[PDB]
Amino acid sequence: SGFRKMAFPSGKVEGCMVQVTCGTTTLNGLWLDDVVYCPRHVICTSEDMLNPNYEDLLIRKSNHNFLVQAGNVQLRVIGHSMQNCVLKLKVDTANPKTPKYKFVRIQPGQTFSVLACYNGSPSGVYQCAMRPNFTIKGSFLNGSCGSVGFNIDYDCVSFCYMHHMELPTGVHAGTDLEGNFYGPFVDRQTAQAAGTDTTITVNVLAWLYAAVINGDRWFLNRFTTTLNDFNLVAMKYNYEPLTQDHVDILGPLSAQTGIAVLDMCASLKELLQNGMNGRTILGSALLEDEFTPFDVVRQCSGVTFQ
Amino acid sequence: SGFRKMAFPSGKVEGCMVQVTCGTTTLNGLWLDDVVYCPRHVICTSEDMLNPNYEDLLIRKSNHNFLVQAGNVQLRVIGHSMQNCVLKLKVDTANPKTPKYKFVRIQPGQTFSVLACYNGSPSGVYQCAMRPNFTIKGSFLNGSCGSVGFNIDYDCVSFCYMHHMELPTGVHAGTDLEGNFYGPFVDRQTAQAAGTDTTITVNVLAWLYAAVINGDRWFLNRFTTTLNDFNLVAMKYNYEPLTQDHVDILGPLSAQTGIAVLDMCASLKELLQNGMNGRTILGSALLEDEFTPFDVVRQCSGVTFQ
Ligand SMILES: *C(=N)[C@H](C[C@@H]1CCCNC1=O)NC(=O)[C@@H]1[C@@H]2[C@H](CN1C(=O)[C@@H](NC(=O)C(F)F)C(C)(C)C)C2(C)C
Numbered sequence: 001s002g003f004r005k006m007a008f009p010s011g012k013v014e015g016c017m018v019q020v021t022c023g024t025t026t027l028n029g030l031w032l033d034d035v036v037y038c039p040r041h042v043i044c045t046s047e048d049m050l051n052p053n054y055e056d057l058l059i060r061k062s063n064h065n066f067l068v069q070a071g072n073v074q075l076r077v078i079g080h081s082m083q084n085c086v087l088k089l090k091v092d093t094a095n096p097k098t099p100k101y102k103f104v105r106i107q108p109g110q111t112f113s114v115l116a117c118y119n120g121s122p123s124g125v126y127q128c129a130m131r132p133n134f135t136i137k138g139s140f141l142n143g144s145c146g147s148v149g150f151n152i153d154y155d156c157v158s159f160c161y162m163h164h165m166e167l168p169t170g171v172h173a174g175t176d177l178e179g180n181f182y183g184p185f186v187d188r189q190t191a192q193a194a195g196t197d198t199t200i201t202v203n204v205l206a207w208l209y210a211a212v213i214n215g216d217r218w219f220l221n222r223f224t225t226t227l228n229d230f231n232l233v234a235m236k237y238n239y240e241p242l243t244q245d246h247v248d249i250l251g252p253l254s255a256q257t258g259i260a261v262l263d264m265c266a267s268l269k270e271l272l273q274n275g276m277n278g279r280t281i282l283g284s285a286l287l288e289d290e291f292t293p294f295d296v297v298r299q300c301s302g303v304t305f306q
Numbered sequence: 307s308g309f310r311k312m313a314f315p316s317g318k319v320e321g322c323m324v325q326v327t328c329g330t331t332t333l334n335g336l337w338l339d340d341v342v343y344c345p346r347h348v349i350c351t352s353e354d355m356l357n358p359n360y361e362d363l364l365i366r367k368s369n370h371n372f373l374v375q376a377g378n379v380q381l382r383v384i385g386h387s388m389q390n391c392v393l394k395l396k397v398d399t400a401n402p403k404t405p406k407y408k409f410v411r412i413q414p415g416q417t418f419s420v421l422a423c424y425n426g427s428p429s430g431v432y433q434c435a436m437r438p439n440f441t442i443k444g445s446f447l448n449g450s451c452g453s454v455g456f457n458i459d460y461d462c463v464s465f466c467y468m469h470h471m472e473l474p475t476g477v478h479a480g481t482d483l484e485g486n487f488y489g490p491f492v493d494r495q496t497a498q499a500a501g502t503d504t505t506i507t508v509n510v511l512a513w514l515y516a517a518v519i520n521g522d523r524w525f526l527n528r529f530t531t532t533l534n535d536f537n538l539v540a541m542k543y544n545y546e547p548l549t550q551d552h553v554d555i556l557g558p559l560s561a562q563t564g565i566a567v568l569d570m571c572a573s574l575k576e577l578l579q580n581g582m583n584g585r586t587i588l589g590s591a592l593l594e595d596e597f598t599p600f601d602v603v604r605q606c607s608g609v610t611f612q
């Protein structure tokens with residue numbers, strides 16, 4: 001037992017990070033087979049980033065201007081192109097550590113691990129959720145751009161996020177690996193604001209099931225509710241609507257505990273209307289919404305990857 | 307900016323996990339050069355674990371009774387011995403992925419990452435602290451024994467924990483890599499209780515400094531305090547005494563923010579006596595004590611390992 005904010009093992013991704021330098025700008029790149037993916041603003045000077053024309057800036061660069069190092073070994077660049085906000089550098093050496101992988105575009109509410117990197121070397125790994133406003137609550141410093149977020153499924157790494165920028169209240173924005181931003185953000189140094197966030201209701205329910213499985217049951221009440229009634233309450237507290245799709249995904253946890261999804265909605269409704277009254281759930285004094293139903297199943301059943 | 311419960315990258319340790327089977331019991335082992343380290347109760351049947359005589363049980367085993375697999379490849383065992391609560395299996399093949407490593411015995415209040423594993427394959431990584439009562443608040447299921455905890459420093463992995471058992475309230479107990487238990491616990495299935503926990507005061511202060519660096523400053527008051535006076539208050543709230551050694555270790559964060567350690571003690575004292583009043587610090591509604599001063603420095607300065 002016990003329940004922790006668990007990240008995926010990072011080894012498969014650590015084998016793919018490299019450092020990319022153009023001029024005096026250095027950030028991280030992702031080396032898969034014979035291509036290096038990195039944020040396109042590696043081609044910017046400081047001044048360029050206020051209002052860059054990336055297509056213009058790239059026209060003036062040639063292969064040899066990109067310095068790619070895997071550890072201390074330089075990888076010779078033999079071609080380059082831009083796909084939305086990501087640069088693709090073809091190199092003359094395939095990465096022998098390339099895992100089975102996919103590029104995926106994740107949906108708001110889904111979680112992934114981030115391997116935070118500087119100068120092509122990993123600093124740490126942590127779990128994140130794509131918020132409903134298309135930001136993530138990460139931990140990123142200068143030089144962390146090109147760090148990636150991923151999920152693993154058996155042996156296959158699904159890369160879902162590349163880090164690009166930080167937004168006013170210390171939240172973070174980035175792209176999928178085809179260079180398309182999550183949310184309405186652009187890679188330009190100008191005032192930009194995320195929309196209002198909302199709580200990922202299906203994830204809060206998943207976490208309450210994790211609590212019950214770990215023996216933390218005080219919040220369970222004797223009532224049930226309709227889907228419609230619950231969603232009326234949730235709206236008032238800035239919770240996402242719960243859909244039948246979400247109910248179906250919660251099915252495995254419901255069947256494990258014997259607690260119907262709508263009964264656990266009645267318990268959540270009481271928590272939202274009355275608060276938790278100085279009490280904790282799974283050691284937390286706030287309701288947690290960064291575990292998906294699949295994350296709870298994985299952790300409570302011991303799913304592995306190797 | 308941002309501040310997250312960050313784990314070390316696990317790749318160096320993932321290369322060392324193997325599965326060890328004796329009879330019908332399977333758990334995880336750690337393969338470094340030509341030795342596999344694993345918990346000694348792999349030699350137990352279910353019934354043996356109520357009151358085992360490990361020296362007796364081991365006398366009746368020979369090398370070939372230990373089935374060691376690195377992935378699907380069996381590693382031939384050519385010798386075996388017991389060192390306290392750990393078994394050391396010599397194998398006829400050195401692990402080519404062995405990192406630079408040390409075995410260390412950590413002190414209460416220090417943190418480490420856990421690579422949770424089943425059948426020799428990694429499930430996830432998370433950060434933990436050795437509590438003052440010599441337990442850790444982990445996430446471990448049946449089959450996770452032999453999972454290890456570690457720190458990294460540049461290129462050197464310090465292994466500090468091997469997982470052995472779970473204690474009444476869902477907390478966890480284990481050994482260092484020389485087989486010596488942290489705390490008064492034994493590897494026998496009998497009722498055992500951890501002592502009362504206490505809050506790691508130096509770590510709470512480190513985390514308040516992390517808050518200030520991230521711009522969360524509401525709790526800073528205009529006062530100072532003596533070390534002696536602060537420790538009188540902390541005792542009442544079950545906080546560890548703060549020593550001059552702890553003050554010295556907080557020096558780098560103090561110098562970075564310009565906030566003397568004793569001034570931040572005055573702010574913590576007010577939080578303990580008055581509570582946080584519905585407010586959060588770094589997104590938390592409780593004071594957090596699982597970041598050491600070094601963890602804060604590492605994360606806020608972007609220290610890497612590769
Ligand atoms: C890439 N290494 C950095 C990562 C930042 C750096 C600041 C701290 N936290 C991070 O995640 N990315 C950039 O610096 C990025 C680049 C330039 C400006 N920029 C920003 O993140 C800026 N954000 C905005 O201007 C916007 F969000 F208001 C700030 C945080 C002001 C530097 C470009 C090319 C968008």
Ligand SMILES: *C(=N)[C@H](C[C@@H]1CCCNC1=O)NC(=O)[C@@H]1[C@@H]2[C@H](CN1C(=O)[C@@H](NC(=O)C(F)F)C(C)(C)C)C2(C)C
Pocket residue numbers: 001333347350355446447448449450451470471472473474478492493494495496497498
């Ligand atoms: C090793 N794979 C397991 C890990 C456990 C299993 C239960 C769930 N969480 C874990 O960490 N270790 C054991 O099973 C261990 C072994 C046997 C009994 N034991 C325990 O952990 C037991 N604990 C106690 O008996 C004591 F703490 F009260 C329980 C949790 C009751 C199985 C030995 C050889 C100590």
